Design a protein around this ligand. Structure first.
Ligand SMILES: NS(=O)(=O)c1ccc2o/c(=N/O)[nH]c2c1
Ligand SMILES: [Zn+2]
Length: 257
């Protein structure tokens, strides 16, 4: 099955998922001098006051916090987006070392990790239909660097002991994802893909310019998760990131100059 190892990693995914070599694949490198400032872009609308976290899960490739997306409780709108997108889940991608782990890169800079808040477009009724659409998903990507701790992440960090291995899950209610945001909502945006199988080219990517800082103790707790399931040889869940893909016929736009 696909993964991040030597024989099943990103260079192998195209065999089961040919779109891996597609025309709008993610992640990409964001060349900050090539990105064009688009003043017709709008401020992002991040409406997370009514979010309903449900459960946290080790899915064998990352850990995920899922929300109630049966109503417009936590939505993203504005920016380059038409319509309302509902928050389904967030997860991260991270490294074995602080100099690597993000999927997007900024002028080839790799961040220690990248947070992905996954939203689907309500005009398509469910996430399974959205992923079949060129504008089906909006993913808000936030870079993590190692520095001061991020207080809003500590509730997540403290429960990872209970979901160490693949397919473990736990209650995770009343978590407020507003605690993971930076101060600025300035962003880059381009049309792209899921960065894990099926690599569907359904994503409007919205990548915030500003990292959040997390502590070394917080990120070290990511690195104690396992790719494997209980009763299997231990393999630490590190370097679960896809590297940058060719931009091809695409222009990265910036909401800021
Ligand atoms: N890593 S990502 O581009 O935010 C992302 C988000 C939602 C996803 O659902 C997926 N199918 O199992 N892959 C995937 C990647
Ligand atoms: Zn992701």
């Amino acid at each position: 099955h696909w993964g991040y190892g030597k024989h099943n990693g990103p260079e192998h995914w195209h065999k089961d998922f040919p779109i891996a070599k597609g025309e709008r694949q993610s992640p990409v490198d964001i060349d900050t001098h090539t990105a064009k400032y688009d003043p017709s872009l709008k401020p992002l609308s991040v409406s997370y006051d009514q979010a309903t976290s449900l459960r946290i899960l080790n899915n064998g490739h990352s850990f995920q916090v899922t929300f109630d997306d049966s109503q417009d409780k936590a939505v993203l709108k504005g920016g380059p987006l038409d319509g309302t997108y509902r928050l389904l889940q967030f997860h991260f991608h991270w490294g074995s070392l602080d100099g690597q782990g993000s999927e997007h890169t900024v002028d080839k800079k790799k961040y220690a990790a990248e947070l992905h808040l996954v939203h689907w477009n309500t005009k398509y009724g469910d996430v399974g239909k959205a992923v079949q659409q060129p504008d089906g998903l909006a993913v808000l990507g936030i870079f993590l660097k190692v520095g001061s701790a991020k207080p809003g992440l500590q509730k997540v960090v403290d429960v990872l002991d209970s979901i160490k291995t693949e397919g473990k899950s736990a209650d995770f209610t009343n978590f407020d994802p507003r605690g993971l945001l930076p101060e600025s909502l300035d962003y880059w945006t381009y049309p792209g893909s899921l960065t894990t199988p099926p690599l569907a080219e359904c994503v409007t990517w919205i990548v915030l310019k500003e990292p959040i800082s997390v502590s070394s103790e917080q990120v070290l707790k990511f690195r104690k998760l396992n790719f494997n399931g209980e009763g299997e040889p231990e393999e630490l869940m590190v370097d679960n990131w896809r590297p940058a893909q060719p931009l091809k016929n695409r222009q990265i736009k910036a909401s800021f100059k």
